[PDB]
Design a protein around this ligand. Sequence first.
Ligand SMILES: N[C@@H](CCC(=O)O)C(=O)O
Ligand SMILES: N[C@@H](CCC(=O)O)C(=O)O
Length: 416
Amino acid sequence: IDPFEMAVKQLERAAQYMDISEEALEWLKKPMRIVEVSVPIEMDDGSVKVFTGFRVQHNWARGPTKGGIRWHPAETLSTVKALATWMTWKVAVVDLPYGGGKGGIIVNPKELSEREQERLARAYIRAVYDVIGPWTDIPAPDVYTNPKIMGWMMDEYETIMRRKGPAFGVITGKPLSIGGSLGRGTATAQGAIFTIREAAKALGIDLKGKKIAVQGYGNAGYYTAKLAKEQLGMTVVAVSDSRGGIYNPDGLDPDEVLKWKREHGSVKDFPGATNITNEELLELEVDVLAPAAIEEVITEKNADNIKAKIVAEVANGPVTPEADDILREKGILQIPDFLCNAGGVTVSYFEWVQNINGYYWTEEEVREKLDKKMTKAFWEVYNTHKDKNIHMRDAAYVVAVSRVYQAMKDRGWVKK
Ligand SMILES: N[C@@H](CCC(=O)O)C(=O)O
Ligand SMILES: N[C@@H](CCC(=O)O)C(=O)O
């Protein structure tokens, strides 16, 4: 199951719903630049180990490419290419002057010390310097990379760059001390909450007092539940982790559950709550269900059993296309994954804007701008959903690919 293959198939399926020339589709099926580099670092024992690093820039018709860096032992070039392709549509659906791109190093960072991690980050920047920049390619944190590594990478880039321009804007997700942006820790959850609110408004539902079930209790799931309870006033009845689920009709307090999970490593056996598992958790009678964990969790095996009026796909591809079908004919509004979790990329654009301008904002300004962006993106996707009578996801693909195609035509890359 080649990751890249799946992305190309999804793009073709999408192109089956819109008027796009075959030359433009052939252009969009290939990354515009792929860079594979050797990343040599000096280990703590004195030896030199060489790692494999990637930087894929799928498309830059709309502006500089944007995408995170993954440090995973199972990283492959095809995975990076597929993720860069998805990043293109993600920045296009939420309307950002960005293209799509992604990077990665095939490494197990859990067995690297802090000094070796810093050496790896600096060596990666020294290797890929010639294809990145504030107006060329802006990396960001991703799987097993965090703001600390982002700061190390920014410092190395500034050292090579001799401070001749906005070196802060070369990479996002930085610490606040060095050009970091506020509201960035709860970006994804805030965007998901905004999309859920707009979806409820579209469906004619006032969310105050109804049930939400969240699967996955990392930063995304926990903050999704928390912001749901405060901003949307909904009742959080079920949460789960990489172990099991906890359900309470009266409502769970996300802060207490987070304390429980930190203390014991799992959310299981929470006081005054029935312990359950993920499979039966996916089908509680709730108004909103927010899968925020590992991919491929809703499948034709249990798609019919889903009873949530609104499904917000915080995670990347939690729902299979077949389940997309059954959920559609069941009457359930799905927020597509790369529209729902648009908060992350959105915030990163805001941070870049701040770095380029040299002027930073506050929490309220970031929050308001994110609200407007996510509301507009959701409403465009939903209006395409209505007008073309296609799936929500397919509408997101229509919006994003239409924007990229228009940008490609405007530059004259494709003459038709
Ligand atoms: N992996 C992140 C990167 C976004 C960013 O550039 O901040 C995402 O697209 O969700
Ligand atoms: N990768 C995250 C969602 C996307 C993000 O946080 O950037 C998850 O699966 O929970």
